[PDB]
Amino acid sequence: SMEQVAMELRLTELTRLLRSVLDQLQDKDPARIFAQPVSLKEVPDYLDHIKHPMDFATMRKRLEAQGYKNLHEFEEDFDLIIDNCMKYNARDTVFYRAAVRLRDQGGVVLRQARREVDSIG
């Protein structure tokens, strides 16, 4: 149908906007701490602690399959990156501190993303 096409164009355009959001958030992680999944070879107990691992590569895979229907779903995944790190790692670690800085800096980017998503529809 023509409606299904129009819906698909909307999803494509959301995917375009989320790709730019993802790039801007990942720039706030210059150490690449959150770039890839925590290695289960290197942290073999990880899944005993963290039930839903997340990282920027995993988000990018979902994004490119157009697997984010709305901004809320994308934000859920970004918040998992931060929140998983802040639980597994202690306050006095470079990992925890990296997550706090990513959260704080990312907030700005996400605030305007929400306005753009609503504005453009």
Write a structural description.
The protein has a single domain, classed as Bromodomain-like (Histone Acetyltransferase, Chain A). It is built from five helices and no strands. 69% of the residues lie in helices and 0% in strands. The chain is globular. It comes from Homo sapiens. There is a cross-link at residue 41 (Glycyl lysine isopeptide (Lys-Gly) (interchain with G-Cter in SUMO2)). It is found in: Nucleus; Chromosome. This is Bromodomain-containing protein 1.
- Report, as a whole number of angstroms, the end-to-end distance: 21 Å
Order of helices and strands: HHHHH
By CATH, the superfamily comes out as Bromodomain-like
Strand percentage lies at under 5%
What is the top-level CATH class? Mainly Alpha
- Could you tell me the radius of gyration in angstroms? 16 Å
Number of strands: 0
State the CATH architecture: Up-down Bundle
CATH topology, by name, is Histone Acetyltransferase, Chain A
Set out the fold topology.
Layout lengths: L1 H26 L18 H4 L6 H9 L6 H18 L5 H27 L1
Helix pairs in contact: 1-3, 1-5, 4-5
Keywords:
121 residues, mainly alpha, Histone Acetyltransferase, Chain A, 0% strand, Bromodomain-containing protein 1, gene regulation
Task: Describe this structure in a few short sentences.
The protein has 121 residues and is an all-alpha fold. The protein has one domain (1-121): Bromodomain-like (Histone Acetyltransferase, Chain A). It has five helices and no strands.
